[PDB]
Structure formats: C-alpha cells, structure tokens
Design a protein around this ligand. Structure first.
Ligand SMILES: Cc1cc2nc3c(=O)[nH]c(=O)nc-3n(C[C@H](O)[C@H](O)[C@H](O)COP(=O)(O)OP(=O)(O)OC[C@H]3O[C@@H](n4cnc5c(N)ncnc54)[C@H](O)[C@@H]3O)c2cc1C
Ligand SMILES: [Mg+2]
Length: 280
C-alpha cells in the first residue's frame, strides 16, 4: 500500500564502532512500522548546516576522529534529502526503528562535500525530531529449509541483525545458519554479546568475527584477514554442497564484490546469492 509517514523522536544515537552510530527512533503514539526483516525506511532531513565538531562521539572512538581529521568537516545542505536505512531491529522489537549508519565523510585528502544525510544523522541528539517514510524492502529471507550463510561488513550489520534475530527468535527456526562478519579490529565489532548469546541458545546457529587489522589491545587469536578468504578457508572450501546454501550479503562495495566472486567461483549460482547493495 501507499507509503506511510511518521514523525519520530531520537531515543539514542551512540557510536557502536568508530565510524558507525546506532540511531534509535521512537515512533509516535505507541505505533510500530509493519516491516519485514531486511527491509528499510527512508529518513528525511531539512536544509541545514552541520559541523562535525558538534557531534557526540563516545570517548574510545575519538582518537581516530582526530587521526582522520574529521573535526574540521562542515556539511551545508540546501534542500531536503531522503535516504534509505535498513532496520537493525527485527519486527518483534516494537515501537522503534533502529539503524546502523556509517558517517560518509569526504575521502581523506579530497575537497568533496561531506555526505549529506549521514553527517546530519551524526549530529542527532536524544529528543530531536526525524521524519520517517515506509516501510520498504526486498532483501528478504527465502522460505525454505536450506542452510543459510549471512555475510556482513560495516553498517551492513543492520540487516544482518534483523535477519538473524528474525530467524532465531520470531520464527524459532531450526535451519542451519551461520554469520560471518568482517571488521578492522575489536573496537569496530558490535552486537558481539547478542550473537554469542544467540549461539549459546540456538545450536543451529554459529557466528564468526574476522579482523583485518587487529590492534595490540585486542590480544586477538581469532580469524584474520578478509571475510571472503576466511569464509572460504574455514568453511566453504570443505563444504559438501555449497551450491545448496542460501547466501545473504551486505557489506561495503569491495566486500560485496570479493564475496560474490569467491562464491561464484565455487560454483554457487547467482540465484542463491541475495545482496543488499547500499550503493557505496
Ligand atoms: C536500500 C538501501 C539501504 C541502505 N541501508 C543503509 C544502512 O543501513 N546504513 C547505512 O549506513 N547506509 C545505508 N544505505 C546507504 C544510505 O542510503 C546512503 O547512501 C549513505 O548514508 C550515504 O548518504 P549521504 O547522504 O550521507 O552521502 P552522499 O551525500 O550521498 O555522499 C556519499 C559520499 O560521496 C562523497 N562525495 C560527495 N560529492 C562527491 C563527488 N562529487 N564525487 C565523489 N564522491 C563524492 C561524500 O563525501 C560521501 O562520502 C542504504 C542504501 C539503500 C539504497
Ligand atoms: Mg541540535
């Protein structure tokens, strides 16, 4: 049916990684968005000016905001903008829409304008008003009993969380499900306690974190490198029938491309790979 519209209030907007915030919007009037896991809404901003030095960035992330010279950026937006963001909540988490949003700052060294909507999102404080439109979606789980392999990176965590909670807690599914998330270091990993608990509670579910640049403080002895190599070496290379799995992918462009190439090379048919392309 026609697009619905809600004037929401910001409940919380902390960083969950150095360059990713978890934005939670409370819907008005006790309403909920009738969305499906993997779906999205559009957020809108009015004309504005935002200065990055005004952002609230939690303490452990600030050193890299200094290193990346982020505090000098200013974004001037002369007209209303709309952008899609994927729900990180699943449908049984009512009354809110929750997001994982990467700050799309200018490439280091360039003179390009900062990202219009994400810069505005990073200055949202509890109590601010945000207009939301939707729901929309196409990145939906197939209705089968096949093994599921979820692959995520960056703010692609949002539909990954939605999908995984939907399978395990709403559908109470017993399908074989794994989740593979690539990040730079432990400070860039989030929802780790949630996934560890879901693995403890659901013997059909397993997750894996691979770090590309583990930091000394991480004392990391787990998987390292790029997620497409990790998933191949530690699981798919020896899998009896990878072509029988359903793959659900959402990451930054380079990750999407590398994972899809790895899978197609293994003989997985493109029909068995569902991609949520954020268009980065
Ligand atoms: C279905 C869907 C779901 C999505 N879900 C999410 C999600 O859950 N989380 C999320 O973080 N994103 C998501 N996205 C992406 C999101 O909609 C935005 O595209 C993203 O936030 C960037 O928008 P922006 O307005 O901040 O940046 P834009 O203003 O669009 O700019 C993007 C980048 O381009 C740079 N730039 C500016 N001018 C130029 C130029 N001339 N040449 C080159 N580069 C330039 C900017 O500095 C910035 O880095 C989704 C997209 C879709 C389609
Ligand atoms: Mg303000």
């Amino acid at each position: 049916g026609p697009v619905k519209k809600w004037e929401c209030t910001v409940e919380s907007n902390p960083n969950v990684a150095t360059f990713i915030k978890e934005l939670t919007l409370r819907l008005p009037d006790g309403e909920s968005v009738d969305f499906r896991a993997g779906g999205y809404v559009q957020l809108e901003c009015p004309p504005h000016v935002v200065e990055y030095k005004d952002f609230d960035i939690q303490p452990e992330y600030r050193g890299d905001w200094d290193k990346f010279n982020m505090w000098r950026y200013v974004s001037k937006v002369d007209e209303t903008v709309i952008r899609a963001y994927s729900m990180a909540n699943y449908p049984e988490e009512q009354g809110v829409v929750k997001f994982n949003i990467r700050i799309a700052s200018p490439p280091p060294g360039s003179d390009l304008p900062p990202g219009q909507m994400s810069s505005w999102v990073f200055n949202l404080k509890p109590g601010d008003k945000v207009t939301v439109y939707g729901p929309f979606g196409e990145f939906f789980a197939k209705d089968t009993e096949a093994e599921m392999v979820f692959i995520g990176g960056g703010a692609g965590m949002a539909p990954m969380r939605s999908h995984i909670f939907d399978q395990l807690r709403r559908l109470k599914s017993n399908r074989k499900i794994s989740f593979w998330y690539g990040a730079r270091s432990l400070r860039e990993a989030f929802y780790t306690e949630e996934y560890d608990q879901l693995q403890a509670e659901n013997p059909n579910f397993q997750w894996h974190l691979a770090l590309s640049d583990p930091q000394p403080e991480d004392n990391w002895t787990g998987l390292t490198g790029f997620i497409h190599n990790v998933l191949f070496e530690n699981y798919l290379k020896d899998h009896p029938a990878p072509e029988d799995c359903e793959f659900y992918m959402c990451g930054p462009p380079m990750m999407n491309a590398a994972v899809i190439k790895m899978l197609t090379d293994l003989g997985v048919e493109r029909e068995n790979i569902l991609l949520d392309d954020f268009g980065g």
